Design a protein around this ligand. Structure first.
Ligand SMILES: CCCCCCCCCCCCCCCC(=O)O
Ligand SMILES: CCCCCCCCCCCCCCCC(=O)O
Lengths: 161, 161
């Protein structure tokens, strides 16, 4: 369902620390609680020389902020990865400037809108109006029903408080 | 903190059934859970001939969808009401066409952004892109951190499911 992707993406250049400035989902139950399914906070991206991609994130599990390491296997499209969970979930890089932000979405295979979540990643704990601009514009199309945003304070905290 | 209001508002003409198409809050904890503080669904508005305003809403309380009747006492400004809870909370009518939608916000007295929530009300269980347009434009300024939207199905349901 995600319609735009970043052309000529250089996945090595996205390596580094990132902040989940904002997130949006097609379903409220995707982001509603602290424990919700795709309510995940990004730490840093770590691509492998084979073009793969390892991800370090926090995920509130069992009334507690847990760290996590996911792996996204690159595919034939530079901007689309597939993580190693059950039901081949696709992670799509929409856009990025490598040093200011990253807009990615992640959807179910064969089931978009029921499972579809997008994030605005920034390199600093500062809210980026330009970035949020592009993010809201990108999802303007998409059928999003929930939408969060975090403050600098919450971004320096584990699990955004 | 809410900066725009509806001029020459005719509070009698807002009488009737309404749907909470969308909501936004300055704080995630205002709308996060089913039980959150300003996560309230509107049924119908009922103004009194003295220009007062009685409100019927649903509010998930104790893991259960409860109905509720609030009263908003009119003030010297036609578009601003004050409901009878502790700490004089102000309800502000931003805009409306009486027969398509209503954009209102409700804030704390002397404490905006910590407590500030806004809704897009529509007369039908249809999502209204024009309406959501105006709503997102109105809050574009405001410091909102959470934002929900509901589908026709959820709007015919008590507590939006
Ligand atoms: C290419 C840009 C990288 C963007 C980061 C992608 C984040 C993937 C997160 C997938 C959700 C999985 C988290 C839930 C963990 C669990 O299984 O409990
Ligand atoms: C003038 C337009 C009318 C808009 C409707 C205003 C809705 C007011 C809701 C105030 C929040 C109070 C709900 C919580 C109830 C409780 O005390 O448990």
């Amino acid at each position: 369902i995600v319609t735009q992707t970043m052309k000529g993406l250089d996945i090595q250049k996205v390596a580094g620390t990132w902040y989940s400035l904002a997130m949006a989902a097609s379903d409220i139950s995707l982001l509603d609680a602290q424990s919700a399914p795709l309510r995940v906070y990004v730490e840093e991206l770590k691509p492998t020389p084979e073009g793969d991609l390892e991800i370090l994130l926090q995920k509130w599990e069992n009334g507690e902020c847990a760290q996590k390491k996911i792996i996204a296997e690159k595919t034939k499209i530079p901007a689309v990865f597939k993580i190693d969970a059950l039901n081949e979930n696709k992670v799509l890089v929409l856009d990025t400037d490598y040093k200011k932000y990253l807009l990615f979405c992640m959807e179910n295979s064969a089931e978009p809108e029921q499972s579809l979540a997008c994030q605005c990643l920034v390199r600093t704990p500062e809210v980026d109006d330009e970035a949020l601009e592009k993010f809201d514009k990108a999802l303007k199309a998409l059928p999003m029903h929930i939408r969060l945003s975090f403050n600098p304070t919450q971004l320096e905290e584990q699990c955004h408080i």
